[model samples]
Target: SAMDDEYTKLLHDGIQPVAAIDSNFASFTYTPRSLPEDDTSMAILSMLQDMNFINNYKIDCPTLARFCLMVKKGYRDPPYHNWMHAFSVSHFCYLLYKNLELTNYLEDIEIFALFISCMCHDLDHRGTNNSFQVASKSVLAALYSSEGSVMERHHFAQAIAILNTHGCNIFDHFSRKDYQRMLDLMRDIILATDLAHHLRIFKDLQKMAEVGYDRNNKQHHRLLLCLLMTSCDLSDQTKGWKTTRKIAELIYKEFFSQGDLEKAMGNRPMEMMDREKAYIPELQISFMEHIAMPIYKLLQDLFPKAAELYERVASNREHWTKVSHKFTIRGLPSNNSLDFLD
Candidate 1:
C-alpha cells in the first residue's frame, strides 16, 4: 500500500539530481565511497541523464527514478553486494559507457541493457558464492543449481520482478519485440556475471581478443557485452591501492563469514574462505595474478585507454606482494587476518 504509493508518486515527481558531482565522478578512479549514501539514487539518475538514455528512449523520468529506487531496495545488507556495491558497479558501467563510448559499437537498446544489467547484476546477493548456495541447499540452489549460475539466475529473476512492478517499468513504452529483446539481452548479460561462466567461455574470449574486436560480428558483440559486464563487476580492483585494499578486505570478510557458516554446519571450507587458514596477502596476490589481472589485461587489449586501468591493478598487486613475504616467511596463521592493512 504505502510502498506502492511511493512508487506511484515517484512516477510523477521523479528525484532531484545530486549537484556538482566532480568531474572524476565519470572516471575510472572514482569511488562510490566518496558520495553521501542518501544521494546514490540521484547519482544513478545523473548517470542515466548524462548518458542521454532518458531523452533517447523517451523514458518517463519519474518512472525511471522509481525503477532506480526499486532496484536499490532489492539488495540485501551484505559486507559487499549491497546497494553501494550495485551503485559502484553501475557507476563503473557508466564510466565504461562514457569513456569507451560504447554507443559507437553497440546499439542503443544493447547499451541500455548493459547499463541496466550492471545495476541489476548482483541483485539480492546474500554475500555468499554459488557453491555456498549448493552446499547449504539454499532454495535458490534447488531452483537453478542444476543448470548452474544459481545466484545469477536469482538476480535476473529479481531484476525482472523489479521491472514488472507497475510504476517501476522504465521500458514500459518499448514495442513488443523490443521489450522481448531487452529481456533476452538482460538475461544473457546478467548470467555472464558468474565467474564459472566466464571460465567456460574464456577460450572463446581469448579467440575474440586474438582476432581483434569485429564490430559487425554478432558473436563478438555478445562476447564484448559479457566482457564489459565483468569489467564493471570487478572495477573495484581498478582503483588506487587504498580503495582497492579496502574493498578487498570487505570481500574477504564476506568470504570468511561464509566459511564460518560452513564450519558450523560440519562442512569444510576452501582455504581461501576459511579465516583460520587464509593468508590475506597471499590470497589477494593470487586473486590479482590469476583472476583480476587477466580481466584488466583483456580490457586493455581491446580498449587501449584501459591500459591505465590495468596499471592500477598492477600497482595494487605490488602493494600486496610487498607484505606477502611476512606471512610466507614466518608461516603465520590466518588469525593475523588483515592487520597488514596498516
Candidate 2:
C-alpha cells in the first residue's frame, strides 16, 4: 500500500530533479568524459535531462526524477556496488549511445532498454561473487540455487520491483506490447552482464559484423545491445589514469571485502581477491590488456567512434606498467611482486 502511494505521488508530481553537475557535463554528448563522483541522484538526472530522456520517452519529468531516486535508493551502498557505481556505468552507456552516431538505427525503446539495463544490472548486489555465495553457504545461493546466474537473477527481480512502484513506471505511456518487449529486452541485457555470457554474445556480434554490420538488422541490434552493456560494465578500465585508478581501487575495496568474508568462512581467498597479496599494478595491467582492450577493439570495429575507447584501455595499461616500473626504479626487490610484473 505504501509502495503504491509512493509511486502514485511521484507520478502525480511529474517533476525532474537538478543534475549533480549543471547541464555542462550533459552537453558533452559525443565526449564520454568523467562526472564528479558525488551526488549520485543529481548526476543521473543531469545526464538524463541533457539526453532528453524524459522528454523523448514521453515521461512526466517529476515522475522520472522520483523513479531515478528510488532506483538509486534501491542499491545497498556496498563498498563498490553503490549508487555512484550505478551512475558511472550508466553514464558510459549514455555517452556511447548518445554520441555513437549510428544509434539512429536503434528504435527509441531499444535505446531506453540499453541505458536502463546499465543502471539496473547490478541492483542490490552483495559485494560477493556466486562461487563465494555457494562456498560460504550463504542464503542467496540456496535461494537462487547454483544452477543459474544467481546474482543476475536477483538483480533483475529487484530492478523490476523498483520499476513497478506505481508512478515509477516510466513506461506507463507505452502499450502493453511495447511494455512487454522492453521487459524482455531488459532481461536479456541485464543477464548478459555475466562474464560467462560474453563469449557467446561476442560471437553473435562477430556474425553480425560478417553480414556487413548492418545496424538496422533486427538480430544485429539485439546482439549489439548486449555487447554495449558488457563494454560499459567495465568502462572504468577504458578511462584515463585518474578515473581508471580510482575505479580499480574502489573495485578492490569490494573484492577485498569479499576476501575478508571468505577467510572468515574458512575458504582460502585467491590472491587477486586478497588485498594484502594483490599486486595492483600487475592486476590492473593484465585486465586492461586481455579483458578490456580486446572488447573495445571489437567495439571499434562495429563503431569506429569507439577507437577512443580502445586507446583509453591501452593508455591505462601503460600507466599501470609505468607504476610497476616506478617501484622497480626505487630498488624494490626484483623478485617482489611490487617492482614489476615482468
Candidate 3:
C-alpha cells in the first residue's frame, strides 16, 4: 500500500536521520547501554519484542523503529525527561494493546494511529506537570484553558507537529481520508491521558464491561483500549517497592528541578516546594497515598486476576512509608542507616 511504502521511506529518510543525530549526542554524553540495560531506546524495543505484539501482529518494523527514535530524540534534553519514560510508556502501551486484542477490533489505520499516539504521547515533555503551566501563567495554559493542567497542550502540539513533517510523518503511508481518521484517533488517545480524563475513562470502562455490552463493537473496543493504555502509562505507581521508589525519586527530582526553576524565576512553588521540604518518609507516604493508591485501586478493578499485584503494591507502599518514618524520626541521614532501618 502507498501508506506502508510512504511510512517506510519516511522512517528511513526523516525520522531515523534525526534519531541518528540525537544518538550521536547521546553517545557523546553517555555510554550506550545494551537492551534492558537502562538504555531507554533498547529497553523499549526489548519490551515490545518480549510482548511479541509488533512482530507477531506484523506491524511495520521501520515505523516502530522510527517511533523509538523519535522518543529518544524528544528526551535528549536537560533535567532529562529522557527516553526511559517514553520506553516505559511504550512498553506499557504494547502490553495493553495486546491484552485488549486492539488489532482485532481496530482497522489497520486505527492501529497505526494508536501506535503513533503512544509513541509520541509525551514528546518534548519538560518533566513538569500541568500545575507548572498554570502557576507560571504560561501562555500554554491560556492557550489550552486552565482546565486539563500543564504540558497537555505542548505535548499534543509537539506530536502533531511531527506528523506534519513531510519526511517524518507517520501517516505518510495513508491516503488523505485515511490519514485524517488516523490523526483523529491519535489525538483522541493522546488527549485522553490527561489526569482530568483519568477517572472518567476508567469508570466508563468498568461500566461498559459490566453491562455486558458487545466487546466486539469497534468503537467500544477502541475506547477501552485507549483507557487501558493510559492506565498502563500511569502504572509506575503500582510497581514493586524498589521500582516504585526509584520512580518516585526520579519524579521528585523532576519536581524539585522545576521548583528550582520556579524559584529562580521568582514564582511561588506549589507541590514542588512540598517535595523539597518533605523528609524521605513523608515524601514516600505522600506519593503512595496521593499517586499510587488511587491508581492501583483502579487497576485492581480493571484486571481482577491482577488483584494480587495491586495488593502487593499497596503493601509495599505502606511498608516503605513505615520504614522511612522510623528512620526519619531517628534522625539518621546515612545510606547505611536508611538501608538498615528498612
Candidate 4:
C-alpha cells in the first residue's frame, strides 16, 4: 500500500518532462550537471522517450517513472560514481542510440539493456576500486571478490533489487524470455564496467574491430555491447576540457580519500592515489592515451560518426600534455588540475 502510494505520487507530479530550453538534452555535448539535480529523473524519462524505448517495450509510464526514481536512489554520493555520473553515462548511451542509430545495428532489447546497464553500472559504488575492496576486505569484497568485479556485481544486484521492488518493474510487461535476456544483458554489460574486465576483453574487442562489426554475429553483438558500455562509463573524457578536467578532479578526490584510508589501514596506496605523490596531468595523459582514446578510436572505426568522441578525447590529451609541461618546468600546479574543489 505504501509502495502503491509512492508510485501514485510519482505518477502524479514526480516525473516531469524535460524543459524546452534544454534542447541539447540528448546530445553528446550535453552535460547532466547543467540541469538542476532535481530534474535528473525527468531528464532520464525524456531520453527514454526520445529513443522510443517506452513505445518499443510497451513499458508502463508509472512503473517506468518509479523505476527511474528508485534507480537514482540506488546510487551513493561518491565523488565520481554518484547519480549524476550514472545519468551522464546513460545520456551517452542515449546519444549512441540516436547519433550512431544503433537501432540498425543492435537489437532493440540490447539497446534497452545497455541503457539500463549504464544507469546502474556503478550503483551503490563506494567511490573505491575493486583493489581497494580486496585490500580492505570490505563486506562486498568478501561477498564477491572471489569472482572479481566485486563492485560491479553488487551494482547488478542492486539494479535487480530495484526491479523486484513493488511497482518498480519496468519490464513487467515483457515475456518471460525477453525478461531473462534483459537480466543477462544487464549483468554482462554492468560487469564489463570494471576496467580489468574491459582489459580482459580488449583483445577480443580489437579482433572484432580488425574483422569489422557483424550484426549477425552474436559474439560481435556482445563485444560491441561491452565496448559501448565502457564508452558510456568513461564518456566524461569526451566532453569539453573544462568538464573533463572537473570530472578528473572529482575522481582523484575519491582516489586520494581511499589512499588516506589505505594508509590508515597500513596498506600502501598507489602513486596516483597518493595526493602527495600523484601527478594529475601526467596520470590524465596516460589514461587518455591508453584507455579512453583507444576505446573511442575503436568505436569511431565501427561507426565513423563517433569520430567526434575520439577527437574530443584527443583534444583533452593535448590539454593535459600542455599542463604536464608546466608541471615539469615550474612545478607550480602541484596537482593543480585536480585542485579544482568546491
Top-scoring candidate (lDDT):
4
- Rank candidates, TM-score, best first: 4, 1, 2, 3
How many clashes does the backbone of model 3 have? 4
lDDT of 4 at 25: 64
Please list all clashing residue pairs in model 4, or write none if there are none: none
By TM-score, how accurate is candidate 4? 0.92
Per residue, candidate 3 scores C-alpha lDDT tens digits across 1-342 of 644554455445432222442343222112122224234554455445555545545546675666555555665553435566655556555544545445544565555555556667777777777777777777777887655734655676877776565445545656788767777776677787776766666567666656644646766766665665565565565445666666667767777888887888887677545555646556667666765565655555555644654676678778775677465445566553667544
Evaluate all candidate structures by whole-model CA lDDT and list the values in order.
0.87, 0.75, 0.59, 0.87
- Ranking of candidates on lDDT, top first: 4, 1, 2, 3
Q: Across residues 192-255, which tens digit of lDDT does each residue of candidate 2 receive?
A: 8887778756677777766666765788787878778888888877655787878787889999
Count of clashes in candidate 4: 0
Candidate 2 error regions (>4 Å): 1-39, 326-342
Pick by lDDT: 2 or 3, better one: 2
Off-target runs (Cα >4 Å) in candidate 4 are: 1-10, 13-21, 325-342
lDDT of 1 by residue, 80-142 (tens): 889888888888988898788787778888888999999999999999999999999999999
Candidate 2 lDDT: 0.75
* Model 3 lDDT, residue 65, Cα: 60
Better of 1 and 2 by lDDT: 1
Among these predictions, the greatest TM-score belongs to 4
Give the TM-scores of the predictions, in the order they appear: 0.91, 0.84, 0.71, 0.92
